[PDB]
Every structure is written in structure tokens, then in C-alpha cells.
Amino acid sequence: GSPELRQEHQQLAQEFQQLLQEIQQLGRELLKGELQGIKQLREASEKARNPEKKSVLQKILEDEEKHIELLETLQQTGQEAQQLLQELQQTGQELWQLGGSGGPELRQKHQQLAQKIQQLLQKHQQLGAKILEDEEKHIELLETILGGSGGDELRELLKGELQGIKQYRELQQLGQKAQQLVQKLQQTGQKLWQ
């Protein structure tokens, strides 16, 4: 348990804390965008005359209703990761300051917390990945019905879906980074608290 290994590990914990905060902020921005989208989608649907267009907007609406539930779950998984990370950093602060009473139980608790965050980040990544595949399909479907009666509202929809997909792709990239960081947090923690 070198001092350099302690510094690397605890720094990784702080990098991971900051990354999870940036992921959680992005998640809140995506939910705001989903809620705005579904307003503009429910309107344009009721404003659609062509059944070829009403059909497409209705399929998208059903997916957006599911996306709100999936995003609630995604954000909650992120919040749970943030709570366990607070508890992990606490456990490590105790391990560094204690001796004797404050040994195996706490060392195990540290590695248990790291493993649970690793599981939560996999759930969080999978939820985001499923929503993204849907948004790709929505851009393709909106592109097919572009131009006509409601072309103004359809334009404003496609534009929100294009800004939204960039944010979902960013969330998945940041999640890839977070998974790599928590793998390294776990492995350095094992080396320290073995």
C-alpha cells in the first residue's frame, strides 16, 4: 500500500466523482429535452392530417412515453452510484486513519461498494444504449415524413431529436469513461486494502 498507490486511487475516486456529477447533469438535460420533445410530438400528432404521418408520430410518441420511464430508471441508477461513491470515499477515509479495530470488515466494505457501483454503471450504460437506438430510428422516421402540412412543427421535432441524439451519444461516451475509471478504482483498491 504505497503512498503513490494511495494518491493514484484517491485521485481516481475524485475524478470519478466529478465525471458522475457531469453524467448526472447531462441526464437532467436529456430528461428536460425528452419532456419538451413529447409536448411538441403530442401537439404535431393532433395537428397531423396524413395517416402515413399520424402513424409515424404515434409510434414515436409510444417510444417517448417508455423513454421517460427508462430515463427515470437511468437517472436513479446514477443517483445510487453517487450515494455509494460517497460511502466508498468515507470507507477509504476511515481505513487510512484507523488501525486494528477498523480492519477486515471495512476493507471488505470498500471493495463491496466498488463492485456495486460497477454493476450500477452497467445498468446505467444499458438503459442509455437502448434509448439511443430508438432515437436513431426516430430521426430516420421523422426524415421520411419531412415537408408538408405540419412541416414547421416536424422541422422543430427533427431538430430537437438531432440535438438530443448528440447528448445521448455524449452520455454513452462519458459512461464508457466512468466504467474504465471504476474498473481501475476497484483494482487499485484491491492492491491497497488486500
Residue numbers in the entry: 1 to 194
Article passage:
Recently, we described the multi-step electron-transfer activity of a designed reaction center maquette protein (the RC maquette), which can assemble metal ions, tyrosine, a Zn tetrapyrrole, and heme into an electron-transport chain. The RC maquette integrates a Co or Fe porphyrin electron acceptor (A-site), a Zn porphyrin pigment (P-site), and an electron donating di-metal center and tyrosine (D-site) for photoactive charge separation. The RC maquette is composed of a cyt. b/b 6-like pigment/electron acceptor (P/A) module and a bacterioferritin-like electron donor (D) module. To fuse the electron donating di-metal/Tyr portion of the RC maquette to the pigment/electron acceptor domain, we joined the corresponding helices together to make an extended 7-nm long antiparallel four-helix bundle.
A complete understanding of cofactor binding requires consideration of the apo-state structure and its transition to the holo-state. The heme-bound and heme-free structures align with a Cα RMSD of 1.2 Å when inter-helical loops are not included in the alignment. The heme-free structure was obtained using a crystallization condition that included a large excess of CdCl2. Several Cd(II) ions are resolved in the structure, one of which effectively takes the place of the heme by coordinating the two A-site His residues as well as two water molecules. An additional water molecule in the A-site is hydrogen bonded to Gln111, and the side chains of Trp, Gln, and Leu residues adopt rotamers that would clash with the heme cofactor were it present. Only one of the two His-Thr pairs in the A-site forms a hydrogen bond in the heme-free structure, whereas both hydrogen bonds form when heme is present. These structural differences suggest that the cofactor binding site is only partially pre-organized prior to heme binding. Given that the a/d core of the RC maquette near the A-site includes two Gly, two His, and two Arg residues, all of which are likely to be strongly destabilizing in the apo-state, perhaps it is unsurprising that crystallization attempts without a stabilizing A-site ligand were unsuccessful. In the RC maquette, the high heme affinity and mostly folded but flexible apo-state indicate that the partial fold option has been applied successfully in a de novo-designed heme-binding protein.
